[PDB]
């Protein structure tokens, strides 16, 4: 039997990719159906309760710039915010946040519920229905089939796996969840390449059995950074610090002695590879404001339960620690990204897209970006329009997509800054400047975001124009104060743009100086103008490099 | 392998029964292990987001009086509060609350997290380990066994079942959950009688596709009632009303025509049994303050999906309604309560208890009460002390337990007021008076509850003594005002107790009268004193009946 209404875009799964795909397709204006086997599980961070960092904050910022949901959700569910590489240059600076699991899950679900044009159905999909190489719809478990023009596939066989703990194992997608054996087998029936990977997670520690009085703390920055360009600081809930402990030589001895038990990143591999090192660093991270669990970062393994208990008790401050949920390793399948076009569409089957974990990607953020691109392109194919795949010179999503499609991967792929060929211009602060307009050309950007972006652009342009017009002469009285804040006194009249390019000074002092005061009321605009001017020489050299490379690129 | 530490009480499952059992055993002061297969699912309402009513508010109040958790949790997660049978006599009135699902789940989880002496471990248990008829411990899935003296079993084979939807079916304990096939089969391997039952639930409706402008509303009372004796009104979150619609003759025609498709309480059975009736009543109940789902009460069936869609669209105001989660019926097993002693212990296996859904009882409250009793008795057996089982003349839990153990049941058992042999004294307002002291004799009652109870008893006794001492004479000036509020003028000096026994007057007017003013500052004490005096004649007659019946009872 067929559901009475016809749908245009069908998003299977409910991961992070499914969330982004549904939001994008519905926001564009098409009729969308999201199929999931458990609604209460929507927006669940499987293992690491953290978002952002080096090579992943850029993806989140791009998704936000196109109109995604991850940045706003994390602002609403973030408890500690830090800036990595804060001292170093902006091209490398990044943001990271520790995420409360409950708050994040509620924010995602509430955001999905209120989306117009979106219908969510809680039923497991067992098959795909196709007619002469064009996918027509999906088939659920109870026998009800849905029809649509474009289908985005998320977790077809990712959930076909087995949890491995020590010598034992049992089929399961995650901690106590059913496998997607039907869909995985069905997809395997199709002619595509398949590879196998494994992922391991460490145990959770009861918070009450650990002594925090003997450990050092790390706290967030001040003032707190905000991910999305629209959001501000006050949205963030109350903040909690993380604690730091160090593995002992006794734990090294335990791992060395007991590695034979392992069936074989992981703690045991980390110790084996680096025998010279004698101690590590471990971060205890809260799993919520209303939870008594501690996530230890950096003790991963597949060691049996008793070994894990020994290892965690051997560490400082965790003599009496108790484990609420054991660590474990899980297998899963995926399909090689070498068969997907630059828009993520499958060449073997028409109308079919692959996104997220099914493309051998671990992190939450990379899965979300893949999902946004695949959902956007499936919706565009629905309305019979051209697809849009970013260029490697456009944004980090472009680099990730191109590498996934062409180079391939025999293992999980992790984004890195060094992989980006255009690193000095691909900066988080300007991510929106590189995508918002194009987003508005696809309809993803709504009115408030567009108005804010246009105001930002106008302020940047006006401030730059005034800077170029401004002229400062050494003969002025303030020149003395200018000479106070200059390595050498002025010899001839200098413009604002010329003066600010000096590596020994920044826009702060110019704002302090009467001629260059006052400053832009918009902090992001002021930072962008400072980057353009102070880094005007380096930015110009990089622009020359970009032009030279794009000559062959174009 | 064996977990290093030895535990005394082991609760299996994580339902409402398991929640109560763990809380009671830990409160007593023993080392408790609660085993479950998903911590995120703790305290989940599976069928109806409602707690209380007729024959079930009494159980919740008894659990609260003993020192349970359901009353406080519901006060913290309830959105609409009503009093059923408010106009009628106190021995029949009851409380009901429509409760948010998310808030309730959070409250239960946080309450279990901070319980001293309690260790929660998340891993499915596959077997029981026994040594010459005495259960020694439990066996999980990964191969780690736990040892203890008393074991309370909750869902050993309840989760062994199949969801039936229309013609199709598939194994599952609930919507998208794994079955407990291993434990159920293992228990079946034991020599006990087993029966099969089935339960059905209706679909959830998207809230955005229903028109609430054409429906009547029902709102809670004012001031709001509070379940627990310790709690007050302000704890309750913001309140939402329910909406009412009525099934049409068209839906009756649909059910009559399509009942053949059903594989066969249920809507179809309700229509078939009462052919004379032409219309029903349906209540649309919110599933949370932050959810877009509507639970329709009274359209249950196992009808296939298209039939359910027709039925829900035929009803008034739901022409365009859409279904997020389909309705369905699930099978499950259970063991006849005729093999359990009055304390719930199994005669076939020593040290083994059965509680909750495994005893046939369906509702949340009956399962919770069974769990409290079974956990208390398992803890007492752990410390080698005498078990405690209530008498049918003591509290509704006593009646439920005795009927379950003695009479038996071939189907789910639902508590009713009429089943209670002592209905005029088994009143909710005095439930604590009948249990708190005994609870303190078992240690379940902590210090704050005991102090409040003692203050309540002292106030009741003092007010009663003053009432008996008080004498009112017709010769006083206020007697005129007394004659104002009396059917007949006073002929001789009358005491407070004598005057208040008049069916034509209540303690309110006595408080208004100068001699009987002021009133007790404690509302519960004032109500209890009014019940004792005004119903002094009826209560005395019932006390005589109780004594006569207990002569044979003792
Ligand atoms: C139902 N309809 C319906 C209708 C009406 C009018 C009433 C009064 C009741 C129902 N119910 C029953 C209702 O849901 C009931 O009150 C309650 O939800 C079920 O009992 P409860 O509270 O004890 O929860 P449950 O399901 O038993 O949780 C068990 C728990 O045990 C854990 N666990 C751990 N290891 C396990 C295991 N379970 C099983 N095996 C193993 N190895 C689990 O984590 C569980 O959380 C209706 N019920 C229904 O299912 N459908 C209806 O339509
Ligand atoms: C350092 C690091 C460590 C990591 N460690 C782990 C680890 O130890 N263990 C681990 O599991 N992951 C691990 N990950 C991956 C991480 O969990 C991912 O970011 C994310 O949790 C999984 O991808 P996803 O966002 O797409 O969610 P998904 O898991 O892919 O969610 C898929 C959704 O599809 C829905 N669905 C609906 N119908 C079906 C169906 N028929 N079949 C399947 N699903 C269906 C499901 O409800 C499910 O919620 C790690 C990542 C990093 C960076």
UniProtKB/Swiss-Prot annotation, chains A, B:
Key words, A-Z: Cytoplasm, FAD, Flavoprotein, NAD, tRNA processing
Predominant localisation class: cytoplasm
GO cellular component: cytosol; cytosolic tRNA wobble base thiouridylase complex
GO aspect biological process, one term: tRNA wobble uridine modification
Binding site for NAD(+): 265-274
Binding site for FAD: 13-18, 125, 180, 357
Function: NAD-binding protein involved in the addition of a carboxymethylaminomethyl (cmnm) group at the wobble position (U34) of certain tRNAs, forming tRNA-cmnm(5)s(2)U34.
UniProt protein name: tRNA uridine 5-carboxymethylaminomethyl modification enzyme MnmG
